[PDB]
Structure 1
Amino acid sequence: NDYSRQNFLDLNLFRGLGEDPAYHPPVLTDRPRDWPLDRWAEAPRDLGYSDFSPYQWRGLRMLKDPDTQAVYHDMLWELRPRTIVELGVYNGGSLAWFRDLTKIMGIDCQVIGIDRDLSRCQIPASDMENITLHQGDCSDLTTFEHLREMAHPLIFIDDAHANTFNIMKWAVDHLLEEGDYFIIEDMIPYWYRYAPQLFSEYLGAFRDVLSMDMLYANASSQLDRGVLRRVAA
């Protein structure tokens, strides 16, 4: 009866994130790491550990999978953006990744992390060149005014998914010049499954300003149908 004295957490705290913001190399349970080559044909063919979010960049966790990394790579190489914003930080491995990548492409880029809870960031202070954190609430649209200094072209990425359509209208009006991206990750397929009528009306409300970039918008499951930018249709 271990339950009778336990206080249990709401496991929803870990929705789509996992339990620990820091990376740990996967650990084999039902097999040796070194398999005998004389019994090579008998060796189990499955992954060996959970395939939920096993990705990393330099000892930091990555919530963007390799297919998403390939898309953002092409997008960065093409646009050569001076600014990449990120609503939703979590552990910050995405922030660091964008920074490292741009550095090697020779793009002078500023990466910006806005979140209401920056406590879980895992980047060391001694590895923060061209990265800026920003405490803020999504619901509050005035969180976003103070990033009207940054240069163009610009990529705005929504990994937070709250008050998102109001944030999209705020950006369109006050932020995005021609060519800039507004990308919503993960959620467009769910909103459209759960709310076809309202979703189509809201998305279509931006028919005069944004468009879906078809070169990138079907190239990874995380970005599926959610990559937009300020360009004429």
Structure 2
Amino acid sequence: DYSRQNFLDLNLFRGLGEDPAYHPPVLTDRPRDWPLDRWAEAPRDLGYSDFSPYQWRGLRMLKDPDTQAVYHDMLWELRPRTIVELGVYNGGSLAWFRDLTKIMGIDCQVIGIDRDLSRCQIPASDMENITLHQGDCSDLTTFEHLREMAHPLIFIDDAHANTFNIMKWAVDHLLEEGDYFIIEDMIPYWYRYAPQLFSEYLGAFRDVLSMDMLYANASSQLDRGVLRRVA
């Protein structure tokens, strides 16, 4: 088996999964319809190992429900005119953000940037108020090609490359008082691995960004990574 098979690097699926396309979970060790006469003997665990088993309208979502409630609250209060997502994957959170603002009556343009848009599962007929843009975050030439968009604005780092140089770029070019810059996932790990540089780098933005303590502790993905532009 091993000799007649070339192996993929499982690092490619880091925090993403094996398949960008959504598939409902399969139960492997119980029936789906458990009989009520044996109700007490039914197993109490989830029944499936699916990595991040969350979806919006048939599209995988890497934002888990607690993260979703924070963004709900944030969209409701800010009524953002632009949401930029750095890192697209399957585009599920793109479609989620456009749909949420649509239901809230907020006229919001959702912009998604990725190096690799081939994984995006959103059909063409469902792309109203959603623009894609191919390009690396490993270089800032990607971001300069932006038709100057409306405010308020939420800028979400979901690609985790060159992040502080991008935050610098965002303060110098794009962000206005009240706008958010959000770093998903990485902050607690960066403080863990490099406390001193992290403390200094974040501290270099003391006069331009603050940490929003309404939302910063409300989800584990956004944990201490919700920042906004101060006056």
- Work out whether the TM-score is over 0.5: yes
**Secondary structure in structure 2 of the residue aligned to 1:100:** helix
Contact 2:34 2:42 in 1 (8 A): yes
Flag structure 2 segments of 5+ consecutive residues without an equivalent: none
Q: Deviations over 1:79-122 (max 9, x none)?
A: 00000000000000000000000000000000001010000000
Structure 1 residues 169 and 148: alpha-carbon distance in aligned structure 2, compared to 1, 3 A threshold: farther
**Secondary structure in structure 1 of the residue aligned to 2:202:** helix
Following TM superposition, where does structure 1 have runs of at least 4 consecutive aligned residues deviating by more than 4 angstroms? none
Contact 1:148 1:175 in 2 (8 A): no
The number of residue pairs the alignment matches comes to 231
Q: CA deviation at 1:52?
A: 2.4
C-alpha separation between the residues in 2 aligned to 1:5 and 1:30?
A: 30
Q: Deviations over 1:150-187 (max 9, x none)?
A: 10000000000101100000000110010000000000
Q: CA deviation at 1:146?
A: 2.1
C-alpha separation between the residues in 2 aligned to 1:146 and 1:216?
A: 30
Contact 1:95 1:113 in 2 (8 A): yes
Give the percent of matched residue pairs that are identical in Structure 1 and Structure 2.
100
RMSD of aligned Cα (Å): 0.9
Contact 2:156 2:182 in 1 (8 A): yes
C-alpha separation between the residues in 2 aligned to 1:180 and 1:70?
A: 19
C-alpha separation between the residues in 2 aligned to 1:43 and 1:212?
A: 45
Flag structure 1 segments of 5+ consecutive residues without an equivalent: none
Q: CA deviation at 1:50?
A: 1.1
| TM-score (normalizing by structure 2) | 0.98
Q: CA deviation at 1:51?
A: 5.2
C-alpha separation between the residues in 2 aligned to 1:87 and 1:170?
A: 13
Contact 2:25 2:50 in 1 (8 A): no
| TM-score (normalizing by structure 1) | 0.98
Contact 1:155 1:181 in 2 (8 A): yes
Q: CA deviation at 1:73?
A: 0.3
Q: Which residue of 2 aligns with 1:217?
A: 216
